[PDB]
Design a protein around this nucleic acid. Structure first.
Lengths: 186, 119, 34, 225, 181
RNA sequence: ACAAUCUUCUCACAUGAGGUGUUGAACGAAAAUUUAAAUUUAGUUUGAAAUCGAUUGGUGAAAACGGUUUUACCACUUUGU
RNA sequence: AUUGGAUAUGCCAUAUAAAGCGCUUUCGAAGAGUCGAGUUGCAGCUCUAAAUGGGUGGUCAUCUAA
RNA sequence: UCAGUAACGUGAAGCGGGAAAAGCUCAAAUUUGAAAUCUGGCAACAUUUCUUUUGUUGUCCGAGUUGUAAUUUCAA
């Protein structure tokens, strides 16, 4: 074996053989396969505009202004998913977010360990999904840590009230005692 | 190893937390874009940015590259439809002549011989 | 055993369920009430 | 080293059929069937709507023949749809055959328009289509018409000896056009995946369309072969 | 392709479209410079390239073969047919069993090219089309470079103007109008 | 592919004629019909909510051997051109 | 000949912007194995904080470290 | 200078008098009506203590939402 692989299987197992505190225990019990395929289907409309094609619409916005036309008077308030850890902590404290999504593999685990406790207190329905990179693909990033819907348009409000009800009923309604007991030690 | 003492986060807080009022810059066009538009708009008047139609039509005169500049500043064996020298096969009519399917394998073998067979 | 699954998407038939439940095992009886 | 090249090719033949036989019995997710019961309900509604109080057709005129191709299919289709597919000779998708335009044909052209795309055939395109994909059902076997001797042997009763004479009886569709198509097995216009994106897209076929393509049908034929 | 699959594998369709137009393509200029020094020597080795240009120009579209390059195979052979007809370079012609073998002579070098009949061909399933698409690309440059030379030698346009309406009507060399440049 | 074809008018003439299409469940009125049964059938209600309560007339399309089983909106223009 | 900050003047600028100070029925985030105590030669070892708190000086004054 | 003074042979410091005086920058509050940020590759335009220097603009990756800019540093 190489010099590093025999570490790469051992830190896999020392997360199992030790006593995981109940704060960290919930970060391995995770939203399932099925209900984690509709959340990202709703989000794949509300992606942030790719930075290359936000400029593309900006040169198409700045060419008519150079002639006399405009669209700022008729520009409706935009929509997208809201990301970034520091922007989503303030979206929960202000009770603006409605669905917080926590990655299950943030490397320093303290970055997100207060979020399932903050979402329980502020009444923001939450779920812990796999693969921080899977969130990163949503927002044109390498690794995202968290996302949040704060406002979908009137088109998907009826869809969102249904998909949250799948999030509480599978993550929050279940997983209710494994978050209240220690983990690991297998 | 006790259970999880959620003595505080047991309930739900109903209010928001930060009390400073909502700023006015969340209810109007993004003034950072409006500054960004004016940088692009100015750039058109100085003619450094080709515009959106110019984004399209200057791609279309390209991708036509077929030798636009000058770089230089065995035979048949008398075989035909009615060959009487020997009696391949003799074909009475050109319309009755079939298609010799071995030419694809023969020409590829000759092409592969110049690159793989030695000389 | 018997089951009474509710909140199905409208139009779902026993032909749809028996095609799916047979992947879980034997499907003796099925009744889509109307 | 042709012996080792053939043996490795023989080793390549065995691995291709093994994975084709091993990849079997894929489980059906609960999403597929409920949509199938809906897409079939959509086709049932599309059939009765186009039949009841809709007994009129568009029939793009100025063409004695038309080009109709089933660009796709319906999983567990209706019994009337499949029999019509058996009637229209497009039993398999991506099959190529030109049919004479008629009022009865337009009824069939409006019957499977949800599952097939119609249009008009070009003059020189059909001249190359027969030259490229002319594969008649020779003794029931879809053999290519590589020589006019066999064309004169089978279509001698129809007074057709050459492909040009067959095309002249097809473009200017005569009485032998129906018999020539009866003896000819339909062609297969499988869409060609050229670029690197064509092999990656999820169940895409270079973006075919549905309806009366018209000149675009000739453009589709232009990319067909 | 390991940037496109990164784009296609992350669902971003637009960067998957923006990079295939700027798909990096090498140029075939300096690789025909050194291997064929003289145009007469290039005329001497123009038989197999033009024959291959006349070979794949009549078959159906293959996966490894280029559909757009088929039009290049149609345009290059027609230009070779139009320029030779304009210069009356063809001297000997035989209608053999394989087809019509045309023996011409342009710029001093006598060249023989074999052309087959337009028959209902089928895939041989044994010729490496991957190796054929590469070899045809090596023959696509010489067909155009000679057309860049022959049309300049004859005063015509390189490439000549092609009438699409006559091409859609299958006029052959009449479509590619050999207008004097 | 949990993507998909439900009608953002038509036709005539300028006046017409058309435009077939809607969860479930609970609730409950008083009248008319139609042929005792059915039909129309106020007002309700509610999370695309549900825990036995199925009614049973007619039309035929394929396998099968004239019976037989299979359709999960086959409806009276009545299940495969 | 290289170079300084200026003075006047020419052309550009992009300003849909930025800044000073009133006025507030509103808010006002502040640095830890550090502070601190015990203890060996400001370092070592053991232990380990708080928010009108914490530090240094006479209940007050004065400061705002890591 | 306080001063060989307080304090304990060692030995300051405050005040006062001079010289010189210039202040400030981050972390911690959401840009969320839009990562507005930056390195790099290529190409044009300059420019020089300088053909040797130093930049601007266009363009393509890349860094960056585990936080790059604007804003603020308690005097507020």
């Amino acid at each position: 074996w190489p010099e590093y692989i025999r570490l790469q299987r051992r830190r896999k197992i020392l997360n199992l053989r030790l006593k995981v505190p109940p704060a960290i225990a919930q970060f391995q019990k995770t939203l399932d396969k099925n209900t984690a395929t509709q959340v990202f289907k709703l989000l794949n409309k509300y992606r942030p505009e790719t930075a290359a094609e936000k400029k593309q619409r900006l040169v198409a916005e700045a060419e008519a202004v150079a002639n006399g036309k405009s669209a700022q008077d008729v520009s409706k308030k935009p929509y997208n998913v809201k990301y970034g850890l520091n922007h989503v902590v303030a979206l929960i404290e202000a009770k603006k977010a409605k669905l917080v999504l926590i990655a299950s593999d943030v490397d320093p685990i303290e970055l997100v360990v207060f979020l399932p406790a903050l979402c329980k207190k502020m009444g923001v329905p939450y779920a812990i999904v796999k693969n921080k990179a899977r969130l990163g693909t949503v927002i044109h990033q390498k690794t995202a840590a968290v996302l949040a819907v704060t406002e979908v348009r009137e088109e998907d409000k009826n869809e969102l009230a249904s998909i949250v009800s799948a999030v509480d009923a599978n993550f929050s309604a279940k997983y209710d005692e494994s978050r209240r007991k220690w983990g690991g030690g297998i | 190893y006790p259970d999880y003492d959620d003595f505080f986060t047991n309930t739900v807080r109903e209010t928001p937390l930060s009390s400073a009022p909502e700023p006015k810059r969340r209810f109007a066009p993004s003034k950072h874009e409006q500054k960004r538009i004016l940088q692009l708009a100015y750039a058109i008047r100085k003619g450094r940015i080709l515009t959106s139609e110019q984004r399209a039509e200057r791609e279309r005169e390209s991708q036509s590259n077929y030798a636009d500049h000058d770089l230089w500043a065995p035979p048949s064996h008398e075989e035909s439809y009615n060959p009487p020298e020997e009696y391949p096969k003799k074909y009475k009519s050109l319309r009755v002549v079939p298609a010799y399917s071995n030419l694809i394998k023969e020409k590829f073998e000759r092409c592969l011989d110049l690159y793989l067979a030695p000389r | 055993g018997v089951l009474y699954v509710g909140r199905l998407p409208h139009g779902f038939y026993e032909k749809q369920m028996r095609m799916y439940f047979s992947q879980f095992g034997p499907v003796l009886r099925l009744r889509m009430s109307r | 080293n042709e012996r080792t090249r053939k043996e490795r090719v023989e080793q390549a033949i065995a691995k291709k059929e093994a994975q084709k036989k091993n990849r079997k019995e894929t489980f059906k997710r609960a999403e597929t069937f409920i949509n199938n019961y809906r897409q079939r309900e959509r086709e049932r509604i599309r059939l009765n709507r186009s039949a009841k109080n809709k007994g009129d057709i568009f029939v793009p005129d100025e063409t004695k023949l038309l080009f109709v191709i089933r660009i796709a299919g319906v999983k567990n289709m209706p019994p009337k749809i499949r029999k019509v597919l058996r009637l229209l000779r497009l039993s398999r998708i991506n099959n190529a055959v030109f049919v004479r335009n008629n009022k009865a044909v337009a009824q069939m052209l409006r019957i499977v328009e949800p599952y097939v795309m119609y249009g008009i055939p070009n003059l020189h395109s059909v001249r190359e289509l027969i030259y490229k994909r002319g594969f008649g059902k020779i003794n029931g076997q879809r053999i290519a018409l590589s020589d006019n001797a066999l064309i004169e042997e089978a279509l001698g009763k129809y007074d057709v000896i050459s492909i040009e004479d067959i095309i002249h009886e097809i473009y200017n569709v005569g009485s032998h056009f129906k018999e020539v198509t009866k003896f000819l097995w339909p062609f297969t216009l499988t869409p060609v995946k050229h670029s690197l994106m064509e092999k990656k897209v999820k169940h895409f076929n270079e973006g075919r369309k549905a309806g009366y393509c018209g000149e675009e049908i000739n453009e589709l034929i232009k990319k067909q072969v | 392709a390991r940037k496109l699959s990164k784009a296609l594998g992350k669902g971003e369709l637009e960067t998957a479209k923006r990079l295939e137009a700027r798909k990096p393509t090498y140029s075939l200029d300096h690789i025909i410079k050194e291997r064929y020094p003289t145009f007469h020597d290039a005329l001497k080795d123009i038989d197999d390239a033009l024959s291959m240009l006349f070979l794949f120009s009549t078959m159906p579209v293959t996966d490894k073969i280029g559909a757009a390059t088929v039009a290049n195979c149609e345009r290059l052979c027609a230009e070779f047919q139009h320029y030779v007809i304009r210069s009356n370079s063809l001297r000997k012609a035989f209608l053999s069993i394989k087809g019509i073998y045309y023996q011409a002579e342009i710029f001093g070098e006598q060249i023989t090219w074999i052309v087959p009949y337009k028959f209902a061909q089928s895939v041989p399933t044994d010729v490496d089309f991957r190796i054929m698409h590469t070899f045809l690309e090596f023959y696509q440059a010489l067909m155009g470079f000679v057309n860049f030379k022959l049309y300049n030698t004859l005063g015509l346009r390189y490439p000549p103007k092609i009438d699409v309406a006559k091409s859609e009507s299958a006029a052959g060399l009449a479509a590619y109008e050999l207008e004097e440049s």
